Subunit: 95 residues, 4 copies
Amino acid sequence: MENLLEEVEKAKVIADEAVKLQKEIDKRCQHKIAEMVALMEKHKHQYDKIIEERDSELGLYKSKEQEQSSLRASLEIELSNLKAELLSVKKQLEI
Amino acid sequence: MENLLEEVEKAKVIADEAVKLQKEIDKRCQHKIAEMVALMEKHKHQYDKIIEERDSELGLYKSKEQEQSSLRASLEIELSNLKAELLSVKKQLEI
Amino acid sequence: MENLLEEVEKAKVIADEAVKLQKEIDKRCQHKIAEMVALMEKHKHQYDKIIEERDSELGLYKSKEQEQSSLRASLEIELSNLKAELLSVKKQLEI
Amino acid sequence: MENLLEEVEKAKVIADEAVKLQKEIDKRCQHKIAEMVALMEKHKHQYDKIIEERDSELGLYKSKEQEQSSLRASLEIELSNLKAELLSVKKQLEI
């Protein structure tokens, strides 16, 4: 009759060990998901930082490219004015 | 005297070709930056999607883990009640 | 006649300033590309680390899930053996 | 005496339902980990693609920047040669 009592005790112990082991498995999987979510968050914030910086970057880039284009315009006008004054002196000498 | 005129023309042509080549280089670098920014944006949005989904995930997970724990509680109480009634029958038989 | 000399000097100065400014622009764009490439490399290596770890993870997970399943099997067999011995005692008492 | 039989049956049913629910939870967590691993893999491969392309990019960039520098050198030499021939003509005229 202690047969049944011992068998119910084994049922209890088996159930307990199975439940604790499944809790361990579950927890480990949850922690993996947590750490991957955190890594993704970190990367996402870094990309946000870069994309927010690029607007100020473009403002500065626009200022500099405008100055660059103005310089090219000046250089072209100057080589043209020079070629013109040379065409003038050449004919003054043709006299 | 056409020496100077031709030399100023070469200056013009060299300047023009250098300016167009530097524009090509500049544009290519800008397009690389654009495409990398776009890739980063896509990844960032995907991470946002995942992290926003995980909250609903956790709501569902909580409901299911609560049901699970309630079931374990029921199983423990039942094996205990069973062992107790067996301890009762065993003594009733000891008579 | 110093007109032309001064004008050629201005051409030289304009060309020099334009070239240095375009070098600055170019360099800044190259450095942006560099830093973004480095960030991508860092992220890529981190993902490599995670994906290489997950194989060992799965080995451990398999060991634990096998133990879990064996425990469930034991619990089922035990509750069945118990119900059977109870069906036996019940009839022994029906006598 | 059917009390114990019914109670063992309830233990069996509770255990079965708890085990199936924990399997569902476990599976859902594993599938989340799978899908996140796959997303990370996709991103990692894309970064690999970009970083492998940038080497050919740099080869082309080097060719173009070398041509650019050669052009600047030509422009400088030409404006210098021009200023020199002008300094020559100016003195020939000073006579």
